[PDB]
Structures are given as C-alpha cells and as structure tokens.
C-alpha cells in the first residue's frame, strides 16, 4: 500500500514519488547552468565548484561531447550523469551508422527522454537523478536547445536554465527576451554570445566568477567544443571591460 513511494507505480493522487525524488536528486551538485542560442551558435554555461585541493580540477566536468555536433550538460550526480552520457554517445554513434547522417540534437533528446519514460513505467529500473541539456547547430533546425528530465519529459527552448537557482536565471532571461522581442542573441560571434551568457548568469545569481568558477561549451556549424580556463579568462576579461 505505502510502497507506492518506493517503486514507479501510481499513488492514489496519480503521482509517481520516485520520479519526484529523482528530480530532487538533480540538485545534489548545487550547480546551476544555462544555455542560449546565438545567430548561428549555441552556448552552455555551468558553474564549476572544485573545493577539495587534492582533486585534479581538469578531470571535473558536467559538460559532455556526445558527438562532433551534440554537446550535453548535466545537472545531477556525476555517476548518473556519466551513465547518461555514455548512452547518448552510443545512441549517436549507432544512429549515424544506421541512417547515414548525424543524429539531430532534438532526436537524441527524444530518444533519451523515451528511455527515461521507461524507468518511469518499468518497476525494476530507477530513474536517473539528472536533467540533460542537449545543444548543437542542427543542419536543419539551426542552434538548438533540448532538455530532458527524470519524468521522461522534454522540449526545445529559446534559452534555458537548470539547477538550485533555476528560477532566478530563467526570469532574468525571460525579461531579456521580452525586451529584445526575438528568440535569440543577435550576435555573429560566439565569443560574444558566451559573454552574454556569463553576464546574465552573474546578474541573476548576483555573483562574480573567476576562470575556475565556470565551465563553458560552444556549438557551431559542424562542431561542439568546450573552453579552457584561459579561453574563459579571456571571455571574463572582456565583460569586465564593459562594466
């Protein structure tokens, strides 16, 4: 009777607590992230917090390279994040082999979302405590952002934010778009779109960042890559010379 809270079956209210608690787990890392679309690029920013001195900072990341074109940032525990990453990478490699063309960001999101939907219905699979944000510059849809959650839900966004302070980040962005009247950052270069991202991340969170406080990924026509502490610093120095 009360075990409707331990496995993925309905509660009398028509709810799935385990899915809810999975969502809870996504914040374990206490890290926020956001993504935005440029005129022809897509950027994802995520906080990076490496407090232990014994850690090799370079081996710490929640941004993944799924394919030459798809990049994925994860909000949730690293072990589940890595399980998801590996799967998506496999799903992408396979898709190319079978259908003859690179798997589109939205399709990979759907496929991953469906996989999640299953853990929601089958009782022996637990959901993954993660929220996956996929980004790229689709050869058909252009800059793309698609995120999926432990519920098996997913959708595309103009821009998006995820983490403990998701709301603060979101409304900041909402505002900016209500203003600009367009569904993207009208910028030709990605360096500028990245700067826009870091800037609004700062405004919304009311925090300043050093080069080791962030993690950045950029998706362009036929290539997704991540920035280095230095690539970042350069970007940080730039916004500083505007304030």
């Amino acid at each position: 009777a009360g075990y409707d809270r331990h496995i993925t079956i309905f509660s009398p209210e028509g709810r799935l607590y385990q899915v809810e608690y999975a969502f809870k787990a996504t914040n374990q890392t206490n890290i926020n992230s956001l993504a935005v679309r440029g005129k022809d690029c897509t950027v994802v920013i995520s906080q990076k917090k490496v407090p232990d001195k014994l850690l090799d900072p370079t081996t710490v990341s929640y941004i993944f390279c799924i394919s030459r074109t798809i990049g994925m940032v994860v909000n949730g525990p690293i072990p589940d994040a890595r399980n998801a990453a590996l799967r998506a990478k496999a799903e992408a490699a396979e898709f190319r082999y079978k259908y003859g063309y690179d798997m589109p960001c939205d399709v990979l999101a759907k496929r991953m979302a469906n996989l999640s939907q299953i853990y929601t219905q089958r009782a022996y699979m637990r959901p993954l405590g993660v929220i996956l944000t996929f980004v790229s510059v689709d050869e058909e849809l252009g800059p793309s952002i698609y995120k999926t959650d432990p519920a098996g839900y997913y959708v595309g966004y103009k821009a998006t934010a995820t983490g403990p302070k998701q709301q603060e980040i979101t409304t900041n962005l909402e505002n900016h778009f209500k203003k600009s009247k367009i569904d993207h950052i009208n910028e030709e270069s990605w360096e500028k779109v990245v700067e826009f991202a870091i800037t609004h991340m700062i405004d919304a969170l009311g925090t300043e960042f050093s080069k080791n406080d962030l993690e950045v990924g950029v998706a362009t026509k036929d290539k997704f890559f991540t920035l280095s502490a230095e690539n970042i610093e350069e970007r940080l120095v730039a916004i500083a010379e505007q304030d």
Partner: protein
C-alpha cells in the same frame, strides 16, 4: 539485475477495484483538457498547449499526433506516456496491418491495437498502467469518419463529441448543447474553439492552441503525382495563423 518483477503490479482489491488503473485515471483528470468533435464531413481534435516555461518553444512539442495519414490522436494526462504510445501506435499500424494488407488500418482497428497495448500494461508483470487517455479521430473508406476514446484500462468507446482532462465535465456539457447530427466540419471547429475557451485561463491564441482535423484528402500534401488512386492525407494540423483567423469570427 534481471527484472525480477515478473508479477502483476495491478491487482484486485477486496472491493473489486483495480487501484493502479483508478490512480492512472486520476492522473488523467489532472491533465490539461483536450476534446473531439465529429461532424458529417470531418472530425476535429484539439487541446491547449500549456507551455511549461516562457523559454520553452511550444511548437517543438506536439500533443496532436498523426498516426496514419487518416488518423490523428490527442491526449490528457502524462505527456511522456502518450509520446511512447504514439510511436508504438504508428508502428503497430504498419507491422500488424500495412505490412500484411498494403493499406493503413481502419480507425477502430488501430484504436483496438492501441487499446491492447494499454490493457497489457494493466496485467503484465512489473509495470504500471499508462497514465493517459487518448482521443483518436480518423476516417476509412468503409466506416467513414470516427472518434474514439481510449482509457488506461484499455477500454475504448466511440463518440460524437467528448472531452477529457481538467474541465471534461463542464466541456462535455457545453458540447451536449451545441452538438447535432448536421454539423459541417467548420462548425465543429467553431464549437471546438468555443468549448476550449472556457477551459483556458490566460492566453488563448494560435500559439497556445493545437488543433487538427480529419477531413478531405490533401493531394497538395501528398508529395508526388502520377498515381490516380492516391489522393492525399485526410489528416491536417491547423497552423497558428489558421487558428487566429478563426478566433476573430469567434
């Protein structure tokens, strides 16, 4: 590993109730309203696109899906469940029919196949029922136009018009008033938009609404020409613009 959940997760309670199915239904009542109206020359299914974030792009998510070129579906309840159900539906229409007979299945039969898939999730080992109810509308040369409703139990029934989800009770009542056996498709679309209005709180426009119809054949939407007997799909999803133009004569 190895799924050891070989037993039923939905069983009979002493009162004769099948809990999980009941709960599933509950989950459906919580869902956003969606409806269907059958006219003499067409059917219409519609629902509200309850964007879950102003940053989301409502179009990237469709609640009204084409199953075959003459069958459409809409739901109320759990989106993810409905999504996989739509893929299974589109596939079963092929594997269990088009691949045997060389023609798409007739509405009642596809609906029946979908229903079976759900029924199984009600008795098979280690799973929970689907938390959704569907409204499938289609047309086939021998049965004409039809509209069906499929529940988490696997039950289904034919309707002239109906609604499910949040405001089903109210909406169903408004339909019983305005419906008759002499409606033309445009009328059903009109009644459709009117009915949906009551259920919608905030913005009501071609961007917050999703509506499709099963009507005439769309040769212009076929993609090729040269085969007389192939005239085009009867299923057509209205555009944001098409919706708004209508909202003006609302």
């Amino acid at each position: 590993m190895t799924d050891r959940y070989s037993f039923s997760l939905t069983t009979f309670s002493p009162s004769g109730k099948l809990g999980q199915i009941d709960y599933a239904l509950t989950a459906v009542k919580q869902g956003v309203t969606s409806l269907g109206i059958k006219a003499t020359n067409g059917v219409v299914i519609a629902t509200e696109k309850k964007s879950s974030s102003p940053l989301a792009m409502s179009e990237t998510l469709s609640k009204v899906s084409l199953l075959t070129p003459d069958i459409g579906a809409v739901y109320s309840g759990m989106g993810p469940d409905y999504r996989v159900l739509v893929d299974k539906s589109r596939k079963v229409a092929h594997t269990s029919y088009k691949r045997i007979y060389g023609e798409y299945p007739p509405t009642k039969l596809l609906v029946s196949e979908v229903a079976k898939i759900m029924q199984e999730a009600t008795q098979s080992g280690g799973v929970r029922p689907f938390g959704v109810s569907l409204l499938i509308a289609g047309h086939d040369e021998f049965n004409g136009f039809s509209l069906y409703q499929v529940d988490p139990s696997g039950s289904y029934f034919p309707w002239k018009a109906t609604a499910i989800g949040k405001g089903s009770v109210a909406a169903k009542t408004f339909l019983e008033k305005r419906w008759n056996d002499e409606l033309e498709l445009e009328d059903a679309i009109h009644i459709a938009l009117l009915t949906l209005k009551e259920s919608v709180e905030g913005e009501f426009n071609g961007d917050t609404i999703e509506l499709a119809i099963i009507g005439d054949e769309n040769p212009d939407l076929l993609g090729y020409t040269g085969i007389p007997t192939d005239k085009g799909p009867r299923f057509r999803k209205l555009t944001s613009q098409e919706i708004n133009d209508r909202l003006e004569a609302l």
